[PDB]
Amino acid sequence: PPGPPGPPGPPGLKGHRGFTGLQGPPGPPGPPGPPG
Amino acid sequence: PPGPPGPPGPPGLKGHRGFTGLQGPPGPPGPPGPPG
Amino acid sequence: PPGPPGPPGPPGLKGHRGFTGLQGPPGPPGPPGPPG
């Protein structure tokens, strides 16, 4: 009779790198200014 | 005759994590200073 | 004979989005205070 099914193929390719992260939030307000 | 072709291989590995996002903007200017 | 190897597996999934960026720095010192 015919032979058995062949073996599995190679593993798939690794996925592409993820999207770059979002930008972080703006920083806090600065310190109060110098005295007048 | 030869058996039929094998099945697809296993799925690929997941992609690498994306790069970390940009540092956030500087905060706004601080309050006016105290009176002279 | 056994069949030929199967085709490659499906691609891995896209990577995770990168981490969000750092919060930005504190803002600059505020303006000088009033004269009085």
Numbering used by the authors:
A (entry chain B), B (entry chain C), C (entry chain A): 1 to 36
From the paper:
Collagens are an essential component of the extracellular matrix (ECM) of all higher organisms. All of them share as defining feature the so-called collagen triple helix; a structural element that is formed by three individual polypeptide chains (reviewed in1–3). The three-dimensional structure of this extended, non-globular domain requires a glycine in every third position, leading to a repetition of the triplet motif Gly-Xaa-Yaa. One of the important interaction partners of collagens in cartilage is the cartilage oligomeric matrix protein (COMP) a member of the thrombospondin family of proteins, also referred to as TSP-5.
To elucidate possible binding interfaces we used an unpublished crystal structure of a collagen peptide with the sequence Ac-(POG)4LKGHRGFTGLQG-(POG)4-NH2, which resembles the C-terminal COMP binding motif of collagen II. Docking was performed with ClusPro and the best 10 models analysed by manual inspection. Furthermore, no metal ion would be necessary for this interaction. In the docked model, Asp593 of COMP form hydrogen bonds to the arginine and lysine of the middle strand and the histidine of the middle chain. Asp594 and Asp595 interact with the lysine of the middle strand. To test this model, we mutated all three aspartates to alanine residues and expressed and purified the protein. To our surprise the mutant behaved similar to the wildtype in binding assays, falsifying the proposed model. By testing a generated triple mutant replacing all three aspartate residues by alanines, we could show that this potential MIDAS motif is not involved in the binding of COMP to collagen. Close to the C-terminal propeptide, the sequence 1128GLKGHR1133 matches this consensus. Interestingly, this motif (GXKGHR) overlaps with the recognition sequence of various other collagen binders (heparin, PEDF).
